[PDB]
Structures are given as C-alpha cells and as structure tokens.
C-alpha cells in the first residue's frame, strides 16, 4: 500500500550506497589533504538525497570541528576522509533498516 | 606555593605571572583570529593637520605600497577567489534550465 512517489523514493535511498563507493580520493602529497577526483560519483548521490550540493562536495573535506564547545576548521588528510565518505554510505544502510 | 602533584604549580595560578596569564590569552585569540573566513577593511588618513576637506597625496602614497594594498588589487585580479564545487550547478539549476 506504499505511495507512487514512495515506490521511488526507498530506491533512491536506498540506491545511494552503491554510487558512494565511486569518490576516488587520489594522493597530491603536499600536505596530504586529499579532494576526490571527480563529482559524478557523489552527484549520483546528492541528487537521490537532494541535500545541497554545494554542502556536499565541501564539507566532506572540510567540515566545522567542534573544538571543547567552540568552533574551528580543519582540511581532512586523504585516508581520513576516504574512510569517512565509506562510513557515510553504511551509515545511511544502517539507519534505513 | 608548590613543585609537586602534577609535579608543578597549581594552586592560585600555576607559576604564572601577569605576563603568562596575558600570554595565554595572547595565544588562543591569535589561533582563534585563525579559526574563521575574515574579510577586511583597509581605512587611510588624509593629511595629518586633523584637517577635514583637505587630502594629501604623498601621504597617501606613502601608506599605499608599504600596506602593500597595490599587491592586494594585483592578487584579486590574478587569483580565483572561490574554490568551491561543482555539484551546486546541476541541482539548483535544473529549476532555470
């Protein structure tokens, strides 16, 4: 008795978790800050979410650290983050069940 | 006043004189100043008579190149200002075209 739209839209959750594995972080040892080699690959994940996509493609790599209770910055070392995009694609499974 | 248990000082201040009180405070605002997306403002005397309608010149150039405010117009015509992402189009602009 599921809805016309809610037939697409478990899909498109649900769906995400396969597009998320595709960011490939690639190694620019200067720092060792790492930023993914494409859009595509988060896009097809963005889109199925419709969360802002602007938000999305930074803040993955540099988010707002809560620091005590205060706020800082920070740019996240390549292997941090391409562990970090994998945790959000399980996240998501976990919690959709 | 103590040396031991925390093998140091701690009650009071630790030993901490006016000058390492005001240099911890000297630390975390200048950390802090670091924390954040600043934009300035960059503000110039006219002639040093407290003399209002009046403007010199050489006194402006003066200012001018040690501020080094020429360098500043010369790098925000080079540079790209922005380094933002790609997925941003795609989303809110399906709406326009």
Same mark, same amino acid.
């Given at each position: ?20 594995? !595709?960011?490939?972080?690639? /190694? =620019? ?8 080699? &494409?859009? *595509?690959?988060?896009? #097809? ?6 969360? !802002?996509?602007?938000?999305? /493609? =930074? ?8 620091? &005590?209770? *205060?706020?800082?910055? #920070? ?23 | ?97």
């Amino acid at each position: 008795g599921f809805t016309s739209e809610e037939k697409n839209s478990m899909y498109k959750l649900t769906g995400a978790i396969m597009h998320f594995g !595709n960011m490939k972080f690639k /190694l =620019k040892q200067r720092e060792e800050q790492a930023e993914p080699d &494409g859009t *595509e690959e988060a896009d #097809k994940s963005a889109y199925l979410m419709g969360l !802002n996509s602007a938000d999305l /493609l =930074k803040g993955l790599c540099h988010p707002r650290v809560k620091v &005590g209770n *205060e706020y800082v910055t #920070k740019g996240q070392n390549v292997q941090q983050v391409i562990y970090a995009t994998g945790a959000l694609a399980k996240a998501v499974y976990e919690r959709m069940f | 006043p103590i040396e031991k248990g925390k093998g140091k000082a701690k009650k009071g201040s630790s030993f901490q004189t006016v000058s390492a009180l005001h240099r911890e405070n000297l630390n975390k605002l200048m950390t802090n100043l670091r924390s954040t997306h600043p934009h300035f403002v960059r503000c110039i005397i006219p002639n040093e008579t407290k003399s209002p309608g009046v403007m010199d010149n050489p006194l402006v150039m003066h200012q001018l190149r040690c501020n080094g405010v020429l360098e500043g117009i010369r790098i925000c015509r080079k540079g790209f200002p922005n380094r933002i992402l790609y997925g941003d189009f795609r989303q809110r602009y399906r709406i326009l075209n």
